[PDB]
Amino acid sequence: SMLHILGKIPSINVRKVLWLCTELNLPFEQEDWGDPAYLALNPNGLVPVIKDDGFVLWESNTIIRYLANRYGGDALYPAEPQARARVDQWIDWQGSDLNRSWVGAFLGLVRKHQDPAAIAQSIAGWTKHMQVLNAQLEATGAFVAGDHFTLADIPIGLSVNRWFGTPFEHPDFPAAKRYIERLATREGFKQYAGSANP
Amino acid sequence: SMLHILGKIPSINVRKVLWLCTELNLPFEQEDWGDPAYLALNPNGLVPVIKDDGFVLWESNTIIRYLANRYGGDALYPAEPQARARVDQWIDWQGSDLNRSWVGAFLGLVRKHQDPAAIAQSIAGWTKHMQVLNAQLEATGAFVAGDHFTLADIPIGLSVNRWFGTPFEHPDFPAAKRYIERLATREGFKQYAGSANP
Numbered sequence: 001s002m003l004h005i006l007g008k009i010p011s012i013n014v015r016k017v018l019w020l021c022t023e024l025n026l027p028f029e030q031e032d033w034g035d036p037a038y039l040a041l042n043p044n045g046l047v048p049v050i051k052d053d054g055f056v057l058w059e060s061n062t063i064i065r066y067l068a069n070r071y072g073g074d075a076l077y078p079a080e081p082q083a084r085a086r087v088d089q090w091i092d093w094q095g096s097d098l099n100r101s102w103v104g105a106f107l108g109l110v111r112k113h114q115d116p117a118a119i120a121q122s123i124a125g126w127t128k129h130m131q132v133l134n135a136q137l138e139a140t141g142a143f144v145a146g147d148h149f150t151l152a153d154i155p156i157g158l159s160v161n162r163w164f165g166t167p168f169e170h171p172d173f174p175a176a177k178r179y180i181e182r183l184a185t186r187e188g189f190k191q192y193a194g195s196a197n198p
Numbered sequence: 199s200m201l202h203i204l205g206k207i208p209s210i211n212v213r214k215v216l217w218l219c220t221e222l223n224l225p226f227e228q229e230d231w232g233d234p235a236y237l238a239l240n241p242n243g244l245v246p247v248i249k250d251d252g253f254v255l256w257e258s259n260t261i262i263r264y265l266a267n268r269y270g271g272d273a274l275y276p277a278e279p280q281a282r283a284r285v286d287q288w289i290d291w292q293g294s295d296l297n298r299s300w301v302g303a304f305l306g307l308v309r310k311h312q313d314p315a316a317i318a319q320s321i322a323g324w325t326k327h328m329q330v331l332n333a334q335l336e337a338t339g340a341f342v343a344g345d346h347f348t349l350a351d352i353p354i355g356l357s358v359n360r361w362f363g364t365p366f367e368h369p370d371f372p373a374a375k376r377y378i379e380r381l382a383t384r385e386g387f388k389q390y391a392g393s394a395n396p
């Protein structure tokens with residue numbers, strides 16, 4: 001009956017959900033997933049998928065929106081259309097654009113994609129996206145979507161954690177560094193991010 | 199002051215916004231975009247981006263959520279957390295997973311990516327995703343997220359339109375065909391989808 005979260009902890013998309021549950025003080029049961037039993041839940045064969053008293057849901061960014069909508073307060077995921085859109089914008093950018101930019105460099109330098117040119121190119125594309133994000137963080141001076149922690153800081157925070165947790169010569173993005181150090185005081189970030197969880 | 203939509207009409211992501219505006223009876227000004235003037239609006243250099251009385255927003259799936267939240271009724275984008283999550287799920291699946299699966303085949307067969315193996319492989323991956331979607335449409339027997347038209351049917355409907363508008367030997371997905379014929383009676387689909395707009 002209680003919330004079940006299916007998917008291995010190393011998955012960044014699974015940790016979006018785990019960290020959100022910590023923010024919400026929502027109890028859960030987590031299960032490692034790399035099978036019809038699973039495909040019955042998520043026909044795409046990807047992690048995470050949740051079960052919430054009979055309600056089955058996949059897509060990590062959808063799942064965090066759902067848990068926020070059901071259990072969370074307004075600050076976490078604001079109802080006002082413009083404020084909500086700023087939060088959605090960075091969630092959607094994380095899930096469709098930013099996460100694609102790191103593939104070669106992450107799989108190559110962290111997960112062991114060993115072509116020097118390909119890695120250099122991924123770092124280049126990742127850098128250009130991190131450049132956009134760094135500029136936003138300078139502009140707010142605080143969190144990704146404004147002056148306080150929101151749902152967007154979960155996908156964005158984990159993605160910045162991934163950037164610093166990938167071994168290469170990092171270009172100076174001071175605002176990104178400020179941001180990750182600010183998130184590091186949060187219980188969920190200590191558990192599901194940091195160098196231990198690239 | 200009125201809604202400005204920047205981005206060329208052939209873009210599927212731009213047409214998500216154009217079709218939604220038709221559903222909402224929301225007046226707009228559309229401008230073709232393929233430049234600092236643009237990057238000031240969307241630092242990613244992608245289309246679409248909107249301007250709404252000073253409020254600037256990019257990410258097509260974020261933009262359609264925003265316009266729905268601001269101007270639309272509950273049926274279009276329900277407030278109830280589970281119903282809302284079903285809508286978000288397919289929007290997020292469209293924007294992160296399904297749209298990636300067609301790249302090789304679309305660029306090759308529609309936009310002129312001419313490698314026979316690569317095209318066959320894209321068709322394979324596109325087919326497996328369309329297989330998931332077809333199964334969902336069988337399950338509801340109506341629209342992607344349930345018994346009535348929702349925001350999710352805009353990204354999903356345009357994506358199904360793309361599948362049928364791409365010249366190759368299509369595997370039988372009857373429910374997908376039923377669905378696209380159901381959407382074809384909608385004004386926005388006549389304008390921004392069909393064979394004229396793959």
Ligand SMILES: N[C@@H](CCC(=O)N[C@@H](CS)C(=O)NCC(=O)O)C(=O)O
Nearest residue numbers: 010011012013046047048059060294
């Ligand atoms: N759209 C899916 C993406 C899932 C996906 O494509 N890959 C998973 C593994 S199944 C992932 O976590 N990739 C990121 C990583 O390398 O940690 C979601 O966000 O839930």
Ligand SMILES: N[C@@H](CCC(=O)N[C@@H](CS)C(=O)NCC(=O)O)C(=O)O
Nearest residue numbers: 096208209210211244245246257258
């Ligand atoms: N995440 C962006 C995606 C934009 C993107 O990456 N490409 C645009 C062109 S700038 C597109 O519409 N691609 C689909 C197509 O081939 O029509 C959004 O949804 O707004």
